[PDB]
Amino acid sequence: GKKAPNGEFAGRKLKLKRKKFRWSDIRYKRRVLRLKEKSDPLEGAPQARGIVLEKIAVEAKQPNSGMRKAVRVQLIKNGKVVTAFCPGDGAIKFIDEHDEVIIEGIGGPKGGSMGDIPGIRYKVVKVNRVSLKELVKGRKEKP
Amino acid sequence: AIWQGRSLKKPSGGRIVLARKKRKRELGREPSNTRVAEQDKRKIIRTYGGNRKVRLTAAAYANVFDKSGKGRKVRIIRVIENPANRQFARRNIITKGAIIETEIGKAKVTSRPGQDGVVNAILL
Amino acid sequence: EIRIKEIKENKLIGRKEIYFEIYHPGEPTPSRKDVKGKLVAMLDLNPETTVIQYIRSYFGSYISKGYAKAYDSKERMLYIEPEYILIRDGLIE
Amino acid sequence: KRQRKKYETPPHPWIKERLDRERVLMDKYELKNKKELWKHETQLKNFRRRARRLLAARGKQAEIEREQLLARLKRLGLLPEDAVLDDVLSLTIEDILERRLQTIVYKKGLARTMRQARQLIVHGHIEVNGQIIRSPSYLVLKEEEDTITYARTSPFANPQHPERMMIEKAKQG
Amino acid sequence: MRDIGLRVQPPAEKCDDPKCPWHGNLKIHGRVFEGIVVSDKPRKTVTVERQYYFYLNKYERYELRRSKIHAHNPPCINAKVGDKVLIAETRPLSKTKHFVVVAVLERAEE
Amino acid sequence: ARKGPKRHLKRLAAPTSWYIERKAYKWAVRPRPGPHNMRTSIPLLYIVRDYLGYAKTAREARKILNEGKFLVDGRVRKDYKFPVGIMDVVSIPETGEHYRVLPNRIGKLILHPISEDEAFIKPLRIRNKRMIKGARVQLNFHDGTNHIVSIAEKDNYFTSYTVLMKVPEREILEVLPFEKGAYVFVTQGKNVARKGRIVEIKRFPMGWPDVVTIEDEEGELFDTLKEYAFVVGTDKPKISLP
Amino acid sequence: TLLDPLANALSHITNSERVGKREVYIKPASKLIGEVLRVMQKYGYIGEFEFIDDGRAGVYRVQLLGRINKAGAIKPRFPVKVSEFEKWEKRFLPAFEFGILIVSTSQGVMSHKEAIEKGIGGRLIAYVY
RNA sequence: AGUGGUGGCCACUAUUAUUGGGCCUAAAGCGGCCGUAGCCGGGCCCGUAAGUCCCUGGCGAAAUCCCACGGCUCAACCGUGGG
RNA sequence: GUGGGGUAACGGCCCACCAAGCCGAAGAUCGGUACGGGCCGUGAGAGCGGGAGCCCGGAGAUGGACACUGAGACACGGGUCCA
User: Fold this and answer.
1) Do A6 and G76 touch (CB under 8 A)?
2) One cellular component GO annotation, for this chain's record (chain F)?
3) What is the sign, positive or negative, of the torsion defined by CA atoms of D133, D136, D142, D146?
4) Domain of D158?
């Protein structure tokens, strides 16, 4: 049938219908309830500081094959533990146990896991207030 | 404290959370409760804005008025009936509109002793 | 070269306000003493009663803007004028 | 409130047609950055939006704004004195770039090459109506156009400046 | 009879009540509305109702909106349910009473 | 939270009727209470400093005011927070300069220069009438000034009538009634700074002021409130007016 | 149930035009329909139109000149001021002044162009082009 | 003299659809029917003029918006006048 | 509702007496969230999102409670109590 209501004097039902079926959207629903803000280990921080607990190699999803190095980190902000990728080539050598690391998002879809690596969410940016990009390049030196 | 502020329940009966602490302009004062005794006792209270109110605490005389408009200073033997409360007339407390037994007879008070500081009544 | 564009007399204060241009093509910004000594000539003022407020050099402009005052008695500046401008003009140590 | 950029970046940076057109304009007119070109194009779009809005508006305020728009556009020299509200949509970026200070002085033959004109303007050798201006991106009104000359104190006021005879010979050549 | 500064006719009856606009001590000031009495249970009181059409901009449609106003019914007029009445503003009579009936423009039986 | 009256005034919230650069500084003179409203008046300091340019700095203006060279309605006013309002006469005997404060067609206050003869007369609207003990009549005017007359003379004055007061010694000169055909100036509203002749006085029930219909010099008819109509004459205005 | 005669009439007119029928009969011949039929006839979209006394509601007979691309009724009768025409006109006319809107105003049911010339608002009732 | 990485809002998106989305097979018609409120309602004439449309008076602080002009070299910024 | 107390002052603000009212699906109460508006970002527009430098209005001065002086305070650089 025709879309309804259409009367001059049916503003209330139109507004109520729109409000009713706006909740079916997931983006708006997520924003209003602030669900990410309740679930975020970073609690809304684009960048965070943590302490490395251990080093782990993770297998990439098929058909790709590879041993991706990463580090488990205990977050200073709230204590929760998260795993962060180490970009660059051979960067894992520069990183050590009990190192003050600074991590941010990894940039996957919806801020999730990127590329073939599953489950990971973050990458290591700095270590002991020195950036990983230069350390892999070797331009600067770790303290 | 005697706080004359907003009612803490909405007209629909919903409770209200007070948004701010009580201001000084909003507090009331205590009931004067003019009593019957043999001499006048009063307090002149400084009010908001620097003004004054003469508050009568103990009453001994009253101005009784005949319908022709002549006034007579007189004594008050007692209080007959207090429509405001049954307790006032029992305990000899005078307010506006109560009925007072004086030497002339019965008079009805058209003054507020707690505010005006005096007693004025019309003969009955 | 000094060209006056306004001379206002404040009868209430008793002062002649002086607004002027100074043509200094290819030259530095002139010093206060030189402009004062040049100004006093064709207006016949007392140097002690005259005070020059400001000399602003517009960017990329060889004509500079200047503003000064010329009172009538020696007491008016002391009672009215800011103490610092005379120190700039040197009338006070 | 914060102030906002007066120029609008292109919606997509890597379109071949726009890339090549802008590159040709860059090389011909020799601006330092595409920022200047984008600023000028934003000015064009502003004038076009004003014309669009005014063409569909009825009322005294609309008439006054229309007259003022035409008056300013004529003042810039971008239009003839008998111009109407229609041809303004036909204005191009090149009309504006022709009116630039650098373009005008180079067309006034004071520079062998317009890059040299940019240097002269920057270093303060070029004065407008007796007043210097150090922005080559400045837009020159029509009235100003005849008063554009060398800075008086600058050496180029000297006819014997060694670069000056080269300038005048290249103009003659 | 005393004029209230508004253009209607007084009620014929005179009431001793000191709150009557025509027979009391209070006064009139503020806005005047036309409404329907939809509740007369409280003494010397009415709960008038006013309807209107409020516009919406997103949908360009009108919405029906009803506003209740507690008004003071003097004994002289004695408005009842369903009566179209003219209500006027006064000083605060009570917690909810800030209005008084001026007249009864249309009785329920018609 | 605030615990008393404001004393300072930020330059952004000043009355719109002042020719004052609004972003130049943070602060502006909060006027002291006085004859008019801020909506209808400006501090005298702004008159001395900005409007007349006699003093560049506030301190020079304050000193000149201390010298007592400025007469408001023929009175020395050393208060640099003194509000000067509409139809006031500002005088400088040293320069012999006489101005009247009047609104603009845009709705701002300007100084209309007048002759010396016109400086001793100030037209004052009658805002209200009251009875005071001794059976006397107190007329309260637009500028807050008050005048006392006898009970007998009460019928020569009425609300909104305009009395031509002689402020150097406070003597009444003439009364202009608020009747049809009277020549009127406008003080506020969209029709501010207009002058014409009354055609109708529309009363209104329910509590709205008497809207006056005014014919313009060219015949244009417009409307304004009674509270904004200032009778300036009977058939021609009695004071110079832009 | 027939909630509206006017929209049905205009829909019938358009559907008749598309196939190319010569004569169209409108069954609930209302006064507003007749005033409507006057309008586009004054603008040459149709020819002569006549009323027929049927004894139930009468019937409006029109002949089609093959000059009506589409006609419909703006249903929720939006009140429009003088200045707000281009807003609604951009919504219902294919191009600038292409076709006509019909407005019920204080002075009658009548064309939007003439209403601009009279400078009077009203309520849109139908569009045709 | 900037240029990249991460997070949020808008657009992208007619994936929120009043303009302007779909519901046979792709997510979506209630299994059906009655009916209260709500919403939408045959034609002609008389009446009111509430909505509505036009005119008109007070009002909606300033700054910020847009425009022309003027001051700081142009601009940014600021003043004047209009909206 | 009647009669009072109280106030600078109307008012269940408070008291005495009389009655049973008042609000609610056009969403009350309850819960979450948050200073509000001027405005701001985005978009061709419709619209969507934030309350920020600054202005206007509100409120707070380690949390809770109370009083004096003063026109103005329950008082951030005044006073008393509890934590």
Assistant:
1) yes
2) cytosolic small ribosomal subunit
3) positive
4) 13-170
